[PDB]
Amino acid sequence: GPPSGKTYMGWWGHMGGPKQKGITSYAVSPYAQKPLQGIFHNAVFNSFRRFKSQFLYVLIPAGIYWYWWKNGNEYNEFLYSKAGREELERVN
Amino acid sequence: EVTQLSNGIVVATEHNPSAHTASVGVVFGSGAANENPYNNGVSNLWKNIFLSKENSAVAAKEGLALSSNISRDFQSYIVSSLPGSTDKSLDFLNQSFIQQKANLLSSSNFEATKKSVLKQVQDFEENDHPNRVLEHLHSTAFQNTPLSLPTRGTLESLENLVVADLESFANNHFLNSNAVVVGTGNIKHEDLVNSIESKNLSLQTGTKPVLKKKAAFLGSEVRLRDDTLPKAWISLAVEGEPVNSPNYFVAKLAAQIFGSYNAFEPASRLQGIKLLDNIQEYQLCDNFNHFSLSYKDSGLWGFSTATRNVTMIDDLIHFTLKQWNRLTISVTDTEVERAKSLLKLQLGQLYESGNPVNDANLLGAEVLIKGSKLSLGEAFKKIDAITVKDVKAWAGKRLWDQDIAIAGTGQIEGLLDYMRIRSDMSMMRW
């Protein structure tokens, strides 16, 4: 067949990573162990852990654009209100 | 003929007038399964103490040869000699191994033996791949149970031993109720019993420790990957039959059906084994073999293989397991007929070889479980009585949709995950 280019992945046998030595793996057949073994204590304690870490990365970025839209919505409500047409004519 | 007397210690003897040598030995019913992970390797150290330079020198001065064998279920100490001097072997065995052990457990001798055994185990663990793969297969199949402890002992545990561990093990396990005195070759049973009776030859009181947990099989795998090696070595097995099972010979015959294969020998490429039809085209493997090993509590039935084709491992495993699948549904009569004679020749050479040490080990290991030794003739009739229905009945029970144990080392990156192999134990077309 025709030759091909140079990539960053191989296949089973020549995957292309570094040579490894001195690392051992153990596993057990799933017919011999019980799944669902720790679903509780993971739905409570594990989820709370992850939440407490990544929640100020989403809240403050959502805490800025909520007060920015609200002070524009409650400002647009006064500009088109009967008490805020005089400010409307100076911005229209 | 095999003659066994329970007077004194259990004395077994198999007489062969043709032989020009005679062996006398002691076989103990304890093995590497009787020790724990903290004193693992005490049996190997005892063996190498019996085989030490001073003991072997004193033995060889009289004209005697010493053999020692360590296994899961027994320990063998054999003295071989010429037929006229069979009484001298008993005297050496009494004087050295049994009566006194202070000389063999001196400080310098113990340190030298410990340093030699450590060197041997260190060399084994790095430069002997097909056998250490089988050891890891045992260690992962019977984990947390007595049968999984390696017979040589681990490197980390062998350092912690002192002479106190050795003498404790000798006190706990070297007992009259645990021992069989075996005689093989050109000796007579009556003469052997008379020679024992003249001396005392009492070992100890009895009551060896009883294990609290019986060996159990767990489906599992261990992968020791090393990319600086040229091949990949793989051993795969399922649970088999123990000694004294009704399906022992059926197991050995079903193993003999697939046999062994070497790619470089011209003759073994023409064998009636149908598996080769799938292997030969792309050179999937260099060699494989099939085994049916039996112990006191459980067994292993499977195969072991080595290959340089690191990109086609899964094809090899797939074709082998599809050949195993054929046993349950569509085994043919000609296969069984060939297997009978191949097994008979296979068993024939094993039990009828010239060397009496193998006979001594086999007789001692046999009488410690059965209580008697099966004859060669009665073995053949059970082999001849095997039919297709028996093979199908055994295979539908022992290997159809059953858990497996795997152990591999080398360039095993091509070896797929556990489940993908586990699904190959059924056809799904039947």
Curated annotation (Swiss-Prot), chain A:
SUPFAM superfamilies, A to Z: Ubiquinone-binding protein QP-C of cytochrome bc1 complex (Ubiquinol-cytochrome c reductase)
Subcellular location: Mitochondrion inner membrane
Membrane topology: Single-pass membrane protein
Mitochondrial intermembrane side: 80-92
GO biological process: aerobic respiration; cellular respiration; mitochondrial electron transport, ubiquinol to cytochrome c
Ranges per topology, Mitochondrial matrix: 1-48
SS bond list: none
Pfam families: UcrQ
Transmembrane segments: 49-79
Complexes and interactors: Component of the ubiquinol-cytochrome c oxidoreductase (cytochrome b-c1 complex, complex III, CIII), a multisubunit enzyme composed of 10 subunits. The complex is composed of 3 respiratory subunits cytochrome b (COB), cytochrome c1 (CYT1) and Rieske protein (RIP1), 2 core protein subunits COR1 and QCR2, and 5 low-molecular weight protein subunits QCR6, QCR7, QCR8, QCR9 and QCR10.
Assigned protein family: Belongs to the UQCRQ/QCR8 family.
Protein name: Cytochrome b-c1 complex subunit 8, mitochondrial
Organism this protein belongs to: Saccharomyces cerevisiae (strain ATCC 204508 / S288c)
Gene responsible for this protein: QCR8
UniProtKB/Swiss-Prot annotation, chain B:
CC terms in the record's Gene Ontology section: mitochondrial inner membrane; mitochondrion; respiratory chain complex III
Source taxon at top rank: Eukaryota
Stretch forming the signal peptide: none
Major localisation: mitochondrion
A biological process term (GO) from this entry: cellular respiration
Record keywords, A-Z: Electron transport, Membrane, Mitochondrion, Mitochondrion inner membrane, Respiratory chain, Transit peptide, Transport
Xref: InterPro entries: Metalloenz_LuxS/M16, MPP/UQCRC_Complex, Pept_M16_N, Peptidase_M16_C
Known partners and oligomeric status: Component of the ubiquinol-cytochrome c oxidoreductase (cytochrome b-c1 complex, complex III, CIII), a multisubunit enzyme composed of 10 subunits. The complex is composed of 3 respiratory subunits cytochrome b (COB), cytochrome c1 (CYT1) and Rieske protein (RIP1), 2 core protein subunits COR1 and QCR2, and 5 low-molecular weight protein subunits QCR6, QCR7, QCR8, QCR9 and QCR10.
Family: Belongs to the peptidase M16 family. UQCRC1/QCR1 subfamily.
Name of this chain's protein: Cytochrome b-c1 complex subunit 1, mitochondrial
Originating species: Saccharomyces cerevisiae (strain ATCC 204508 / S288c) (Baker's yeast)
